[PDB]
Amino acid sequence: MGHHHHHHSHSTIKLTVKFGGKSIPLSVSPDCTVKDLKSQLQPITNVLPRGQKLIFKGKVLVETSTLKQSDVGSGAKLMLMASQG
């Protein structure tokens, strides 16, 4: 059978997401988008996905950009302009 090798040989990379003064160690697949991250973190941190501004390389990431398209890798320091209160 022709195995679809598009979604294979992948793994969970380490994302260091900074909630202002809280560094949160995450692990996701490069298949996901930075928007997908907003959706994953929303039920966990309870902060609006619109407010969750992911900023890496001094560059804000777009909903369409995946971890690969966002230059993100295992050990990437992601600045998150969010609200802790």
PDB file of N, CA and C in Angstrom:
ATOM      1  N   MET A   1       0.842  -1.229   0.000  1.00  0.00           N
ATOM      2  CA  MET A   1       0.000   0.000   0.000  1.00  0.00           C
ATOM      3  C   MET A   1       0.867   1.266   0.000  1.00  0.00           C
ATOM      4  N   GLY A   2       0.488   2.247  -0.820  1.00  0.00           N
ATOM      5  CA  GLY A   2       1.222   3.507  -0.882  1.00  0.00           C
ATOM      6  C   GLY A   2       1.065   4.350   0.381  1.00  0.00           C
ATOM      7  N   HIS A   3       1.960   4.151   1.350  1.00  0.00           N
ATOM      8  CA  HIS A   3       1.918   4.903   2.610  1.00  0.00           C
ATOM      9  C   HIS A   3       2.142   6.401   2.369  1.00  0.00           C
ATOM     10  N   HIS A   4       1.235   7.230   2.876  1.00  0.00           N
ATOM     11  CA  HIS A   4       1.331   8.680   2.708  1.00  0.00           C
ATOM     12  C   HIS A   4       2.433   9.267   3.604  1.00  0.00           C
ATOM     13  N   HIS A   5       3.630   9.439   3.043  1.00  0.00           N
ATOM     14  CA  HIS A   5       4.800   9.837   3.837  1.00  0.00           C
ATOM     15  C   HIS A   5       4.840  11.346   4.146  1.00  0.00           C
ATOM     16  N   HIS A   6       3.782  12.084   3.797  1.00  0.00           N
ATOM     17  CA  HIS A   6       3.683  13.509   4.171  1.00  0.00           C
ATOM     18  C   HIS A   6       3.632  13.685   5.700  1.00  0.00           C
ATOM     19  N   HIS A   7       2.707  12.984   6.356  1.00  0.00           N
ATOM     20  CA  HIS A   7       2.611  13.008   7.823  1.00  0.00           C
ATOM     21  C   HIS A   7       3.312  11.787   8.451  1.00  0.00           C
ATOM     22  N   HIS A   8       4.638  11.748   8.343  1.00  0.00           N
ATOM     23  CA  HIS A   8       5.449  10.675   8.938  1.00  0.00           C
ATOM     24  C   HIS A   8       6.813  11.207   9.398  1.00  0.00           C
ATOM     25  N   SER A   9       7.548  10.392  10.158  1.00  0.00           N
ATOM     26  CA  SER A   9       8.903  10.757  10.616  1.00  0.00           C
ATOM     27  C   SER A   9       8.916  12.080  11.410  1.00  0.00           C
ATOM     28  N   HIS A  10       7.745  12.516  11.871  1.00  0.00           N
ATOM     29  CA  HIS A  10       7.621  13.761  12.639  1.00  0.00           C
ATOM     30  C   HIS A  10       7.730  13.496  14.146  1.00  0.00           C
ATOM     31  N   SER A  11       7.901  14.560  14.923  1.00  0.00           N
ATOM     32  CA  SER A  11       8.037  14.443  16.380  1.00  0.00           C
ATOM     33  C   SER A  11       7.621  15.741  17.076  1.00  0.00           C
ATOM     34  N   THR A  12       7.560  15.709  18.402  1.00  0.00           N
ATOM     35  CA  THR A  12       7.143  16.876  19.182  1.00  0.00           C
ATOM     36  C   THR A  12       8.342  17.742  19.585  1.00  0.00           C
ATOM     37  N   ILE A  13       8.409  18.952  19.038  1.00  0.00           N
ATOM     38  CA  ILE A  13       9.489  19.893  19.356  1.00  0.00           C
ATOM     39  C   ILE A  13       9.169  20.707  20.624  1.00  0.00           C
ATOM     40  N   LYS A  14      10.211  21.113  21.354  1.00  0.00           N
ATOM     41  CA  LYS A  14      10.041  21.878  22.603  1.00  0.00           C
ATOM     42  C   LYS A  14       9.814  23.380  22.340  1.00  0.00           C
ATOM     43  N   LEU A  15       8.652  23.886  22.750  1.00  0.00           N
ATOM     44  CA  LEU A  15       8.336  25.320  22.633  1.00  0.00           C
ATOM     45  C   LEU A  15       8.350  26.005  24.007  1.00  0.00           C
ATOM     46  N   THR A  16       9.247  26.967  24.197  1.00  0.00           N
ATOM     47  CA  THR A  16       9.272  27.753  25.438  1.00  0.00           C
ATOM     48  C   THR A  16       8.452  29.037  25.273  1.00  0.00           C
ATOM     49  N   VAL A  17       7.177  28.966  25.642  1.00  0.00           N
ATOM     50  CA  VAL A  17       6.249  30.093  25.477  1.00  0.00           C
ATOM     51  C   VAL A  17       6.170  30.944  26.752  1.00  0.00           C
ATOM     52  N   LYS A  18       6.515  32.224  26.640  1.00  0.00           N
ATOM     53  CA  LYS A  18       6.551  33.120  27.800  1.00  0.00           C
ATOM     54  C   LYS A  18       5.245  33.910  27.974  1.00  0.00           C
ATOM     55  N   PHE A  19       4.454  33.532  28.974  1.00  0.00           N
ATOM     56  CA  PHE A  19       3.303  34.334  29.401  1.00  0.00           C
ATOM     57  C   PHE A  19       3.763  35.496  30.294  1.00  0.00           C
ATOM     58  N   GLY A  20       4.381  36.502  29.676  1.00  0.00           N
ATOM     59  CA  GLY A  20       4.917  37.634  30.424  1.00  0.00           C
ATOM     60  C   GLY A  20       6.015  37.232  31.406  1.00  0.00           C
ATOM     61  N   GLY A  21       5.612  36.747  32.582  1.00  0.00           N
ATOM     62  CA  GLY A  21       6.565  36.303  33.597  1.00  0.00           C
ATOM     63  C   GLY A  21       6.469  34.807  33.895  1.00  0.00           C
ATOM     64  N   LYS A  22       5.743  34.069  33.058  1.00  0.00           N
ATOM     65  CA  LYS A  22       5.609  32.611  33.212  1.00  0.00           C
ATOM     66  C   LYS A  22       6.116  31.868  31.967  1.00  0.00           C
ATOM     67  N   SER A  23       7.244  31.175  32.098  1.00  0.00           N
ATOM     68  CA  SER A  23       7.793  30.371  30.993  1.00  0.00           C
ATOM     69  C   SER A  23       7.152  28.976  30.963  1.00  0.00           C
ATOM     70  N   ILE A  24       6.382  28.696  29.911  1.00  0.00           N
ATOM     71  CA  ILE A  24       5.657  27.426  29.783  1.00  0.00           C
ATOM     72  C   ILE A  24       6.308  26.501  28.732  1.00  0.00           C
ATOM     73  N   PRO A  25       6.927  25.382  29.167  1.00  0.00           N
ATOM     74  CA  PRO A  25       7.511  24.390  28.248  1.00  0.00           C
ATOM     75  C   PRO A  25       6.442  23.506  27.570  1.00  0.00           C
ATOM     76  N   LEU A  26       6.355  23.590  26.244  1.00  0.00           N
ATOM     77  CA  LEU A  26       5.380  22.809  25.462  1.00  0.00           C
ATOM     78  C   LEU A  26       6.077  21.830  24.505  1.00  0.00           C
ATOM     79  N   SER A  27       5.300  20.928  23.911  1.00  0.00           N
ATOM     80  CA  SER A  27       5.820  19.996  22.898  1.00  0.00           C
ATOM     81  C   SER A  27       4.753  19.665  21.847  1.00  0.00           C
ATOM     82  N   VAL A  28       4.896  20.238  20.652  1.00  0.00           N
ATOM     83  CA  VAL A  28       3.924  20.033  19.567  1.00  0.00           C
ATOM     84  C   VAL A  28       4.606  19.571  18.267  1.00  0.00           C
ATOM     85  N   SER A  29       3.801  19.174  17.283  1.00  0.00           N
ATOM     86  CA  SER A  29       4.323  18.712  15.987  1.00  0.00           C
ATOM     87  C   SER A  29       4.360  19.853  14.957  1.00  0.00           C
ATOM     88  N   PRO A  30       5.357  19.853  14.044  1.00  0.00           N
ATOM     89  CA  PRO A  30       5.464  20.874  12.979  1.00  0.00           C
ATOM     90  C   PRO A  30       4.267  20.873  12.007  1.00  0.00           C
ATOM     91  N   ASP A  31       3.395  19.868  12.127  1.00  0.00           N
ATOM     92  CA  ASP A  31       2.156  19.810  11.340  1.00  0.00           C
ATOM     93  C   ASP A  31       1.160  20.897  11.787  1.00  0.00           C
ATOM     94  N   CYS A  32       1.238  21.284  13.061  1.00  0.00           N
ATOM     95  CA  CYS A  32       0.320  22.277  13.633  1.00  0.00           C
ATOM     96  C   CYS A  32       0.645  23.703  13.166  1.00  0.00           C
ATOM     97  N   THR A  33      -0.352  24.581  13.237  1.00  0.00           N
ATOM     98  CA  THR A  33      -0.164  26.010  12.950  1.00  0.00           C
ATOM     99  C   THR A  33      -0.099  26.819  14.249  1.00  0.00           C
ATOM    100  N   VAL A  34       0.422  28.041  14.183  1.00  0.00           N
ATOM    101  CA  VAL A  34       0.434  28.916  15.360  1.00  0.00           C
ATOM    102  C   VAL A  34      -1.005  29.240  15.814  1.00  0.00           C
ATOM    103  N   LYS A  35      -1.950  29.154  14.877  1.00  0.00           N
ATOM    104  CA  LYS A  35      -3.375  29.266  15.195  1.00  0.00           C
ATOM    105  C   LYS A  35      -3.842  28.031  15.977  1.00  0.00           C
ATOM    106  N   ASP A  36      -3.401  26.854  15.529  1.00  0.00           N
ATOM    107  CA  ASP A  36      -3.684  25.595  16.224  1.00  0.00           C
ATOM    108  C   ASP A  36      -3.209  25.677  17.687  1.00  0.00           C
ATOM    109  N   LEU A  37      -2.037  26.284  17.886  1.00  0.00           N
ATOM    110  CA  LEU A  37      -1.510  26.557  19.230  1.00  0.00           C
ATOM    111  C   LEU A  37      -2.477  27.422  20.050  1.00  0.00           C
ATOM    112  N   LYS A  38      -2.963  28.513  19.454  1.00  0.00           N
ATOM    113  CA  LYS A  38      -3.959  29.377  20.110  1.00  0.00           C
ATOM    114  C   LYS A  38      -5.153  28.542  20.610  1.00  0.00           C
ATOM    115  N   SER A  39      -5.628  27.631  19.754  1.00  0.00           N
ATOM    116  CA  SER A  39      -6.764  26.755  20.088  1.00  0.00           C
ATOM    117  C   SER A  39      -6.405  25.730  21.175  1.00  0.00           C
ATOM    118  N   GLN A  40      -5.168  25.229  21.160  1.00  0.00           N
ATOM    119  CA  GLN A  40      -4.714  24.261  22.172  1.00  0.00           C
ATOM    120  C   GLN A  40      -4.550  24.919  23.552  1.00  0.00           C
ATOM    121  N   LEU A  41      -3.930  26.096  23.576  1.00  0.00           N
ATOM    122  CA  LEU A  41      -3.651  26.805  24.831  1.00  0.00           C
ATOM    123  C   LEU A  41      -4.906  27.449  25.448  1.00  0.00           C
ATOM    124  N   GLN A  42      -5.872  27.845  24.614  1.00  0.00           N
ATOM    125  CA  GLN A  42      -7.069  28.558  25.100  1.00  0.00           C
ATOM    126  C   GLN A  42      -7.777  27.834  26.278  1.00  0.00           C
ATOM    127  N   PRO A  43      -8.111  26.521  26.169  1.00  0.00           N
ATOM    128  CA  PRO A  43      -8.762  25.779  27.275  1.00  0.00           C
ATOM    129  C   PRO A  43      -7.830  25.559  28.485  1.00  0.00           C
ATOM    130  N   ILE A  44      -6.529  25.731  28.267  1.00  0.00           N
ATOM    131  CA  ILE A  44      -5.526  25.515  29.314  1.00  0.00           C
ATOM    132  C   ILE A  44      -5.269  26.798  30.123  1.00  0.00           C
ATOM    133  N   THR A  45      -4.966  27.884  29.419  1.00  0.00           N
ATOM    134  CA  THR A  45      -4.601  29.160  30.049  1.00  0.00           C
ATOM    135  C   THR A  45      -5.807  30.099  30.194  1.00  0.00           C
ATOM    136  N   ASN A  46      -6.851  29.850  29.398  1.00  0.00           N
ATOM    137  CA  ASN A  46      -8.115  30.605  29.464  1.00  0.00           C
ATOM    138  C   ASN A  46      -7.962  32.062  28.986  1.00  0.00           C
ATOM    139  N   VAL A  47      -7.000  32.303  28.099  1.00  0.00           N
ATOM    140  CA  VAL A  47      -6.811  33.632  27.495  1.00  0.00           C
ATOM    141  C   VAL A  47      -7.234  33.639  26.008  1.00  0.00           C
ATOM    142  N   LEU A  48      -7.899  34.720  25.587  1.00  0.00           N
ATOM    143  CA  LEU A  48      -8.417  34.851  24.211  1.00  0.00           C
ATOM    144  C   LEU A  48      -7.341  34.577  23.136  1.00  0.00           C
ATOM    145  N   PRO A  49      -7.661  33.732  22.130  1.00  0.00           N
ATOM    146  CA  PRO A  49      -6.724  33.389  21.040  1.00  0.00           C
ATOM    147  C   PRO A  49      -6.294  34.616  20.218  1.00  0.00           C
ATOM    148  N   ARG A  50      -7.186  35.602  20.118  1.00  0.00           N
ATOM    149  CA  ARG A  50      -6.884  36.866  19.437  1.00  0.00           C
ATOM    150  C   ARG A  50      -5.799  37.648  20.195  1.00  0.00           C
ATOM    151  N   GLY A  51      -5.862  37.585  21.526  1.00  0.00           N
ATOM    152  CA  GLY A  51      -4.884  38.266  22.367  1.00  0.00           C
ATOM    153  C   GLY A  51      -3.553  37.526  22.447  1.00  0.00           C
ATOM    154  N   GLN A  52      -3.591  36.204  22.284  1.00  0.00           N
ATOM    155  CA  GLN A  52      -2.370  35.387  22.289  1.00  0.00           C
ATOM    156  C   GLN A  52      -1.471  35.704  21.079  1.00  0.00           C
ATOM    157  N   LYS A  53      -0.664  36.755  21.205  1.00  0.00           N
ATOM    158  CA  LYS A  53       0.235  37.187  20.130  1.00  0.00           C
ATOM    159  C   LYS A  53       1.596  36.472  20.199  1.00  0.00           C
ATOM    160  N   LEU A  54       1.777  35.463  19.347  1.00  0.00           N
ATOM    161  CA  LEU A  54       3.044  34.726  19.265  1.00  0.00           C
ATOM    162  C   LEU A  54       4.089  35.519  18.465  1.00  0.00           C
ATOM    163  N   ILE A  55       5.198  35.869  19.116  1.00  0.00           N
ATOM    164  CA  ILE A  55       6.240  36.693  18.494  1.00  0.00           C
ATOM    165  C   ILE A  55       7.627  36.024  18.591  1.00  0.00           C
ATOM    166  N   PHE A  56       8.144  35.568  17.451  1.00  0.00           N
ATOM    167  CA  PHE A  56       9.454  34.901  17.386  1.00  0.00           C
ATOM    168  C   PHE A  56      10.342  35.565  16.320  1.00  0.00           C
ATOM    169  N   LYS A  57      11.655  35.643  16.578  1.00  0.00           N
ATOM    170  CA  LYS A  57      12.596  36.361  15.690  1.00  0.00           C
ATOM    171  C   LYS A  57      12.311  37.874  15.692  1.00  0.00           C
ATOM    172  N   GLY A  58      11.547  38.334  16.683  1.00  0.00           N
ATOM    173  CA  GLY A  58      11.018  39.694  16.658  1.00  0.00           C
ATOM    174  C   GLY A  58       9.942  39.860  15.587  1.00  0.00           C
ATOM    175  N   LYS A  59       9.360  38.734  15.184  1.00  0.00           N
ATOM    176  CA  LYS A  59       8.359  38.676  14.117  1.00  0.00           C
ATOM    177  C   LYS A  59       7.078  37.992  14.613  1.00  0.00           C
ATOM    178  N   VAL A  60       5.943  38.670  14.488  1.00  0.00           N
ATOM    179  CA  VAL A  60       4.658  38.084  14.878  1.00  0.00           C
ATOM    180  C   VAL A  60       4.206  37.030  13.853  1.00  0.00           C
ATOM    181  N   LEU A  61       3.762  35.872  14.333  1.00  0.00           N
ATOM    182  CA  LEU A  61       3.387  34.768  13.443  1.00  0.00           C
ATOM    183  C   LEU A  61       1.909  34.838  13.021  1.00  0.00           C
ATOM    184  N   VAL A  62       1.642  34.421  11.783  1.00  0.00           N
ATOM    185  CA  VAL A  62       0.299  34.502  11.193  1.00  0.00           C
ATOM    186  C   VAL A  62      -0.450  33.165  11.323  1.00  0.00           C
ATOM    187  N   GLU A  63      -1.778  33.228  11.440  1.00  0.00           N
ATOM    188  CA  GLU A  63      -2.616  32.026  11.603  1.00  0.00           C
ATOM    189  C   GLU A  63      -2.266  30.903  10.599  1.00  0.00           C
ATOM    190  N   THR A  64      -1.864  31.282   9.384  1.00  0.00           N
ATOM    191  CA  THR A  64      -1.574  30.309   8.312  1.00  0.00           C
ATOM    192  C   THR A  64      -0.185  29.663   8.447  1.00  0.00           C
ATOM    193  N   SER A  65       0.691  30.265   9.251  1.00  0.00           N
ATOM    194  CA  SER A  65       2.075  29.780   9.387  1.00  0.00           C
ATOM    195  C   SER A  65       2.191  28.630  10.399  1.00  0.00           C
ATOM    196  N   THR A  66       2.756  27.508   9.946  1.00  0.00           N
ATOM    197  CA  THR A  66       3.040  26.357  10.817  1.00  0.00           C
ATOM    198  C   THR A  66       4.361  26.548  11.570  1.00  0.00           C
ATOM    199  N   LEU A  67       4.635  25.688  12.556  1.00  0.00           N
ATOM    200  CA  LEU A  67       5.897  25.761  13.314  1.00  0.00           C
ATOM    201  C   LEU A  67       7.116  25.820  12.376  1.00  0.00           C
ATOM    202  N   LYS A  68       7.065  25.048  11.291  1.00  0.00           N
ATOM    203  CA  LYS A  68       8.102  25.094  10.255  1.00  0.00           C
ATOM    204  C   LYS A  68       8.117  26.461   9.548  1.00  0.00           C
ATOM    205  N   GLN A  69       6.941  26.916   9.121  1.00  0.00           N
ATOM    206  CA  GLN A  69       6.799  28.204   8.421  1.00  0.00           C
ATOM    207  C   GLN A  69       7.087  29.396   9.351  1.00  0.00           C
ATOM    208  N   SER A  70       7.090  29.141  10.655  1.00  0.00           N
ATOM    209  CA  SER A  70       7.330  30.185  11.661  1.00  0.00           C
ATOM    210  C   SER A  70       8.771  30.148  12.187  1.00  0.00           C
ATOM    211  N   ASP A  71       9.632  29.370  11.521  1.00  0.00           N
ATOM    212  CA  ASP A  71      11.052  29.257  11.882  1.00  0.00           C
ATOM    213  C   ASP A  71      11.254  28.626  13.278  1.00  0.00           C
ATOM    214  N   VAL A  72      10.207  28.006  13.819  1.00  0.00           N
ATOM    215  CA  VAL A  72      10.249  27.437  15.173  1.00  0.00           C
ATOM    216  C   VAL A  72      10.893  26.039  15.195  1.00  0.00           C
ATOM    217  N   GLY A  73      11.691  25.778  16.232  1.00  0.00           N
ATOM    218  CA  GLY A  73      12.317  24.470  16.413  1.00  0.00           C
ATOM    219  C   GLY A  73      12.385  24.063  17.884  1.00  0.00           C
ATOM    220  N   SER A  74      12.869  22.854  18.159  1.00  0.00           N
ATOM    221  CA  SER A  74      12.963  22.363  19.542  1.00  0.00           C
ATOM    222  C   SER A  74      13.946  23.206  20.368  1.00  0.00           C
ATOM    223  N   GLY A  75      13.411  23.978  21.309  1.00  0.00           N
ATOM    224  CA  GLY A  75      14.225  24.897  22.099  1.00  0.00           C
ATOM    225  C   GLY A  75      14.020  26.355  21.696  1.00  0.00           C
ATOM    226  N   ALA A  76      12.960  26.616  20.927  1.00  0.00           N
ATOM    227  CA  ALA A  76      12.637  27.975  20.478  1.00  0.00           C
ATOM    228  C   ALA A  76      11.984  28.807  21.594  1.00  0.00           C
ATOM    229  N   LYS A  77      12.491  30.021  21.786  1.00  0.00           N
ATOM    230  CA  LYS A  77      11.972  30.940  22.802  1.00  0.00           C
ATOM    231  C   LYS A  77      10.853  31.820  22.223  1.00  0.00           C
ATOM    232  N   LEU A  78       9.605  31.446  22.480  1.00  0.00           N
ATOM    233  CA  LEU A  78       8.449  32.166  21.936  1.00  0.00           C
ATOM    234  C   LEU A  78       7.920  33.225  22.918  1.00  0.00           C
ATOM    235  N   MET A  79       8.027  34.496  22.537  1.00  0.00           N
ATOM    236  CA  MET A  79       7.440  35.583  23.322  1.00  0.00           C
ATOM    237  C   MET A  79       5.931  35.669  23.063  1.00  0.00           C
ATOM    238  N   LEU A  80       5.130  35.562  24.119  1.00  0.00           N
ATOM    239  CA  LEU A  80       3.674  35.628  23.984  1.00  0.00           C
ATOM    240  C   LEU A  80       3.107  36.883  24.662  1.00  0.00           C
ATOM    241  N   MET A  81       2.728  37.871  23.855  1.00  0.00           N
ATOM    242  CA  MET A  81       2.123  39.099  24.378  1.00  0.00           C
ATOM    243  C   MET A  81       0.668  38.839  24.792  1.00  0.00           C
ATOM    244  N   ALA A  82       0.482  38.366  26.022  1.00  0.00           N
ATOM    245  CA  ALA A  82      -0.847  38.004  26.530  1.00  0.00           C
ATOM    246  C   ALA A  82      -1.160  38.721  27.853  1.00  0.00           C
ATOM    247  N   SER A  83      -2.272  38.351  28.484  1.00  0.00           N
ATOM    248  CA  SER A  83      -2.690  38.973  29.749  1.00  0.00           C
ATOM    249  C   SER A  83      -2.762  37.956  30.894  1.00  0.00           C
ATOM    250  N   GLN A  84      -1.935  38.159  31.917  1.00  0.00           N
ATOM    251  CA  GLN A  84      -1.983  37.344  33.140  1.00  0.00           C
ATOM    252  C   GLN A  84      -2.874  38.022  34.201  1.00  0.00           C
ATOM    253  N   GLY A  85      -3.225  39.284  33.953  1.00  0.00           N
ATOM    254  CA  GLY A  85      -4.067  40.038  34.884  1.00  0.00           C
ATOM    255  C   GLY A  85      -3.298  41.114  35.650  1.00  0.00           C
TER     256      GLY A  85
END
